[PDB]
Write a protein that binds this ligand. Structure first.
Ligand code: NA
Ligand code: NA
Lengths: 244, 244
């Protein structure tokens, strides 16, 4: 019942997203998949294609060294080998195998360091389109670990009084305006040593301080798009199960 | 190359889950959906059914009072009305509309209070099967809000020097051993007042202290299962878009 004011437009205020977010936890899959699958898609007709890329790079996981512990991590080298075998055929655009370290800094700093590596792998345009999920995904690598601790993508290694070893395996599938005719796939294998006992790590936040020695292995894989709109849903159920 | 030791079995050590987790962020859906869709499924053939339940309860969102701010929240009453219209037909098993409050306690405490309400709605058996996602989902209602702040399920209301108002809309779809022949659907509308400015709230952790006044509105809806294995994927793309 008030008067209608003229428009004051703040060109910096970010508008609320219209993006729909759906998370699926698939109990007891026929075939085990140890990659957290994070998908940024504008056309659901490429969901099947995204899952099938995750199915493939499952074979690029490898055990860590015995001195690290009993863990699986995505290997950049084996990833390259596997990349070649994927059909429809496609190209490895970039790859990285790099150590990241820090001393007595906040976890937030470490997150930014890791983000800097994955942003280099994705590139500016690609980073921008997935910035929210990318940030959240790296955040959830170092914090929010309690609800994740027994999940299929995280593996705990050696556990001393001064240090905890663990691996974390996440995969990004991107298909939007910035990808055009290809879907991009970016698996990431984290091998993390952190200067805290597990009980503390399980409840680490961005405010907590810690020293890290971290190895990141990743690659970027473009696969030309293949719509699946005409295939039955049974084919998607099969891809999720890893039996397709 | 070591000797093979006899088995020492600790019956309390939780085994690593085999559950596959896939998150979809669907850019620019045809129809906007303001519910975070969290799905606990053992058979992907019921994914379509889960999305279609989320599509329906979108219509049960309502604006908050003007004094709260410009926000949408799932309404338990309107939910009941909408429940009746859903096909295939089904039953409202339980519903809640309850205030939860706390004074100068840790955020962790508040999370537990809310969890106690949603566990009452789900029941013991049902709670147990989805305990990890349920805990994470309530955790992400009060913390990890920075990467979420501009997403479609969270709305910011009035923002004073002493208080922040916001709503949070999440939906659980459950289909597993504990559900049998029905899928369960549990939408949740949070109306949250918290005794901190937004800048602080955006970076609240479980360790932070705050006073809350929170209204929770939810219901539990059983729908007999309908497999979609024979339908084309285009039908799933359509359900995601809200055009089916
Ligand atoms: Na961000
Ligand atoms: Na838990």
């Amino acid at each position: 019942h008030s008067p209608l004011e003229d428009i004051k437009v703040n060109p910096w205020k970010t508008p609320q997203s219209t993006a729909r977010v759906i998370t699926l936890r698939v109990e007891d899959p026929n075939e085990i998949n140890n990659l957290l699958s994070i998908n940024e898609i504008d056309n659901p007709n490429y969901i099947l294609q995204a899952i099938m890329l995750a199915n493939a790079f499952q074979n690029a996981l490898v055990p860590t060294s015995t001195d690290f512990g009993d863990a699986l991590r995505f290997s950049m080298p084996k990833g390259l080998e596997i990349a070649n075998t994927i059909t429809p055929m496609g190209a490895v655009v970039s790859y990285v195998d790099q150590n990241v370290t820090q001393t007595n800094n906040q976890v937030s700093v470490m997150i930014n360091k890791v983000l800097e590596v994955l942003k280099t792998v994705l590139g500016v345009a690609l980073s921008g389109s997935v910035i929210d999920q990318l940030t959240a995904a790296v955040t959830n690598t170092f914090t929010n670990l309690n609800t994740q601790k027994n999940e299929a993508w995280i593996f705990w290694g050696k556990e001393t009084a001064n240090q905890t070893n663990y691996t974390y395996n996440v995969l990004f599938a991107i298909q939007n305006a910035q990808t055009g005719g290809v879907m991009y796939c970016v698996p990431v294998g984290f091998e993390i040593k952190v200067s805290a006992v597990k009980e503390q790590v399980l409840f680490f936040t961005i405010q907590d301080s810690a020293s890290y020695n971290v190895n990141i292995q990743s690659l970027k894989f473009a696969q030309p798009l293949v719509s699946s709109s005409q295939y039955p849903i049974a084919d998607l159920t099969s891809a999720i199960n890893g039996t397709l």
